[PDB]
From a paper:
Here, we report the biochemical and structural characterization of OsUGT91C1, a glycosyltransferase from Oryza sativa, which is efficient at catalyzing β (1–2) glucosylation. OsUGT91C1 is able to catalyze the addition of both glucose 2-1-R1 and glucose 2-1-R2 with roughly equal efficiency. It also catalyzes a third reaction, β (1–6) glucose addition, to create previously uncharacterized compounds. The enzyme’s ability to bind steviol glycoside substrate in three modes underlies its flexibility to catalyze β (1–2) glucosylation in two distinct orientations as well as β (1–6) glucosylation.
Author numbering: 15 to 160, 201 to 459
The structure:
Amino acid sequence: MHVVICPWLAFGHLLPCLDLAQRLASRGHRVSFVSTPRNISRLPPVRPALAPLVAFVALPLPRVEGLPDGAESTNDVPHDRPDMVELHRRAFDGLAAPFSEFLGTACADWVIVDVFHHWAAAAALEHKVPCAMMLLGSAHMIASIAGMSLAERFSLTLSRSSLVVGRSCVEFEPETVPLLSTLRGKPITFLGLMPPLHEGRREDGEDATVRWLDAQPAKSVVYVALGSEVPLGVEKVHELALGLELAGTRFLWALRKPTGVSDADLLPAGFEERTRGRGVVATRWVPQMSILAHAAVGAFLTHCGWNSTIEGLMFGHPLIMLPIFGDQGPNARLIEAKNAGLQVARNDGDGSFDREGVAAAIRAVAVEEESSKVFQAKAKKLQEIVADMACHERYIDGFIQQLRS
Ligand SMILES: C=C1C[C@@]23CC[C@H]4[C@@](C)(CCC[C@@]4(C)C(=O)O)[C@@H]2CC[C@]1(O[C@@H]1O[C@H](CO)[C@@H](O)[C@H](O)[C@H]1O[C@@H]1O[C@H](CO)[C@@H](O)[C@H](O)[C@H]1O)C3
Ligand SMILES: O=c1ccn([C@@H]2O[C@H](COP(=O)(O)OP(=O)(O)O)[C@@H](O)[C@H]2O)c(=O)[nH]1
């Protein structure tokens, strides 16, 4: 088959979609991976053996008064500047005509589009190509669901699609998957957890963060990362920093800068001096797979993005969960229900957190002997399912069979 894949302009969508493209191309299918040129330039290279089976289709973002050049992804357009988010959604919707012209002569058997690709589902109808909507989260997230707002883009895309695709399996969510047939009349299929192939990410294993981990004792380091895009304002960065200090563990922290905050204001006065040698903060993209694979990392403090949830559990890390938006609440509650992590306590009213809730969550999951040992044993049980790479490949074969029918 020829499959056209159109991910949302966001690295938590681009990365698993490129992995999927390569898994289809491995079974002898052809893929057109459609995105914007700077997003494509920042992706890991395709295995040379799949090179002619994964065609990159670069559609340049239309210039929209005030959207900076190169600002192509949710990693470049900050959630704390909603004016710029809106400008980015306009640029995205401007891909409609270049995309419809491309699909016309693509000889596509299937279009696989992301949640906001309402124009791509419409092109699919125009050119009579079956259209699958990617909803590459948990069964629990999909059960919860069962210009324009995100809700209207989603509903329009869903209305124009014939198939909805989730990233889970009955083995991980036996209580939800057998209950699901359709999302608003559209058949649901699960292509498995599709945990990333470590090699496929092509990270630097000489990265300074990994060389720091090499000097730490086994299971001693709390890895802290909130994915590629969720906002965390400076007051909340300070509370997370002071929480990490109060719990007293070693930590490696991948931190994104809130817009308009200087290097001097970023972190509490003297925080880096007081934690020097015990903790490292990196305000750059880190090799998350090499970090989670490392013997020194014990617990993962995660925003519970679905990629970070799968990646954390596939290496048997118990989770300290700080969900920010979207599917992260459901993802966090799902893992808490399996006893493999604990949410940071939140105020009902604003959803805020403080240093003490952060510290208490780290202590219970990573420090207190009795609780920490239960969290590790429960994360290990989840790893048996999440890291069953053969099982997940069989789910990709199952999804390809769903598409031929
Ligand atoms: C993956 C997702 C599909 C989504 C579509 C809308 C949907 C969901 C919110 C589920 C419930 C029904 C419904 C219709 C709704 O709007 O209430 C659904 C799941 C999360 C979602 O997340 C988005 O992910 C992107 C990266 O992964 C962000 O670039 C984006 O910005 C998130 O959208 C965010 O949605 C949050 C929840 O409403 C908001 O708090 C946040 O401001 C918004 O950006 C948004
Ligand atoms: O510094 C970073 C931050 C994120 N990631 C990767 O980016 C993705 C983040 O996706 P997730 O669903 O966890 O969160 P999102 O960015 O969509 O909120 C995951 O595959 C991570 O391995 C990374 O490699 N380095």
